[PDB]
């Protein structure tokens, strides 16, 4: 069922690596900073039942079911194993407000939240924007429950991620539920169909580094991930790509001498009919131009296990350059040049 409602959620940009907005859980609402993530399908927030021996719980907002009149107990155990770390707890039901839309939602109350990496998180929890097929405990995702209300103009949602400005008047980003915002893209959308329903993953025809370098020569996969900070490829792919850029490997990332940063070649991703090109300014964290400092790149190695992987992941690095529309009705992803 389709309505005529478009709902927008304003996002805060934390250092070009974390994009989060607000949701309200319970009666009266308890507010949380959440990442709207296409690479996962579960909703979770830290719990008041989390041991204060987990320091990430001490430094985050905690859901207290005892203060909510609309809460409905469940208690089923839940473990969420991600590429960056694991969280676990149990299932709870309550009313969630997201951009003015109110929805009765089943979510995870996290009682085990590791300091590495969650002490580095500015956000409290996660709003999984993925499909039911990837939902742990087969819990209905929030977008499916919003679709069931039949209030949205279209069975789509869109992402705008801005570049990190020091100006407070700068919008960090914006998620539109039920449509797209023409004020944050130009030209037209070009769509690529999903390999299969259940994953925001598309076919990638090839990856180009300048002129003389080539990767994904025989085709590969690309996960379009709003929760991932960077563009990622497999260790092998990223080793060849980084050799071509003259970048040196560290523990969790790759770096270049800051002065070498603006000299780096363009990187192009062949998706559907079009070539999606990023210049050095789009993937180098140009914190200085000094020959005496090292500058990080917004491209990392990440080995995603099957059935989803081995795959590339197009995170915030990609979405900043290209406004993204996630189309559920047609199982496709649309890209347009952001503005
Ligand atoms: C968690 C996160 C939002 C999930 C649910 C899990 C996941 O592992 N990914 C992929 C992913 C890949 C590469 C980098 C990151 N993040 C996410 C950001 C982060 C994550 C954890 C703590 C601090 C900062 C900063 C970063 O490095 C995330 C998701 N699709 N979403
Ligand atoms: C938790 O929720 C699921 C939803 O399908 C339900 O089947 C299960 O029985 C619930 N458990 C309790 C103890 O309420």
UniProtKB/Swiss-Prot annotation:
Query: How is activity regulated here?
Result: Interaction with ATP6AP2 results in a 5-fold increased efficiency in angiotensinogen processing.
Give the enzyme's EC designation. 3.4.23.15
UniProt GO molecular function: aspartic-type endopeptidase activity; insulin-like growth factor receptor binding; peptidase activity; signaling receptor binding
Cellular component, GO, one term:
extracellular region
Q: Which residues form the Peptidase A1 domain?
A: 19-336
Glycosylation positions in this chain: 4, 74
What is this protein's name?
Answer: Renin
Q: What domain of life is recorded for the organism?
A: Eukaryota
Residues of the active site: 37, 225
Disulfide bond residue pairs:
50-57, 216-220, 258-295
Annotated compartments = Secreted; Membrane
As for what it does, the entry says: Renin is a highly specific endopeptidase, whose only known function is to generate angiotensin I from angiotensinogen in the plasma, initiating a cascade of reactions that produce an elevation of blood pressure and increased sodium retention by the kidney.
Q: What is the lineage of its organism?
A: Eukaryota, Metazoa, Chordata, Craniata, Vertebrata
Query: Which UniProt keywords are listed?
Result: Aspartyl protease, Cleavage on pair of basic residues, Disease variant, Disulfide bond, Glycoprotein, Hydrolase, Membrane, Protease, Secreted, Signal, Zymogen
Subunit structure and binding partners: Interacts with ATP6AP2.
Please name the disease the record associates with this protein.
Renal tubular dysgenesis: Autosomal recessive severe disorder of renal tubular development characterized by persistent fetal anuria and perinatal death, probably due to pulmonary hypoplasia from early-onset oligohydramnios (the Potter phenotype). Tubulointerstitial kidney disease, autosomal dominant 4: A form of autosomal dominant tubulointerstitial kidney disease, a genetically heterogeneous disorder characterized by slowly progressive loss of kidney function, bland urinary sediment, hyperuricemia, absent or mildly increased albuminuria, lack of severe hypertension during the early stages, and normal or small kidneys on ultrasound.
Q: Hey, which family's this protein in?
A: Belongs to the peptidase A1 family.
Q: Which reactions are catalysed by this chain?
A: Cleavage of Leu-|-Xaa bond in angiotensinogen to generate angiotensin I
Q: Which residues of the full protein are shown?
A: 68 to 406 of 406
This protein's gene is called REN
């Amino acid at each position: 069922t389709l309505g005529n409602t478009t709902s927008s959620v304003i996002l805060t940009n934390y250092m070009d690596t974390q994009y989060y907005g607000e949701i309200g859980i319970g009666t009266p609402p308890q507010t949380f900073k959440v990442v709207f993530d296409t690479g996962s399908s579960n909703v979770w927030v830290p719990s008041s039942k989390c041991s204060r021996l987990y320091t990430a719980c001490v430094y985050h907002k905690l859901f207290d079911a005892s203060d909510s009149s609309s809460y409905k107990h469940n208690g089923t155990e839940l473990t969420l194993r991600y590429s960056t770390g694991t969280v676990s707890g149990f299932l709870s039901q309550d009313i969630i407000t997201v951009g003015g839309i109110t929805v009765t939602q089943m979510f995870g109350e996290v009682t085990e939240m590791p300091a590495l990496p969650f002490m580095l998180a500015e956000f409290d929890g996660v709003v999984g924007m993925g499909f039911i097929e990837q939902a742990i405990g087969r819990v209905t995702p929030i977008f499916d429950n919003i679709i069931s209300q039949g209030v949205l103009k279209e069975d789509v949602f869109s992402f705008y991620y801005n570049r990190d400005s020091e100006n407070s008047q700068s919008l960090g980003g914006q998620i539109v539920l039920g449509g797209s915002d023409p004020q944050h893209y130009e030209g037209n959308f070009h769509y690529i169909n999903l390999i299969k329903t259940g994953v925001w993953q598309i076919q990638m025809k090839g990856v180009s580094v300048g002129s003389s370098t080539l990767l994904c020569e025989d085709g590969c996969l690309a996960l379009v991930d709003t929760g991932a900070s960077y563009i990622s490829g497999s260790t092998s792919s990223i080793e060849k790509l980084m050799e071509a850029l003259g970048a040196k490997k560290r523990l969790f990332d790759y770096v270049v001498k800051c002065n070498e940063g603006p000299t780096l070649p363009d990187i192009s991703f062949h998706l559907g009919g079009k070539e999606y090109t990023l210049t050095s300014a789009d993937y180098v964290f140009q914190e200085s131009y000094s020959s005496k400092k090292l500058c990080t790149l917004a491209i990392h190695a990440m080995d995603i296990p099957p059935p989803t992987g081995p795959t590339w992941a197009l995170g915030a690095t990609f979405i900043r350059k290209f406004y993204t529309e996630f189309d559920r009705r047609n199982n496709r992803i649309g890209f347009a040049l952001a503005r």
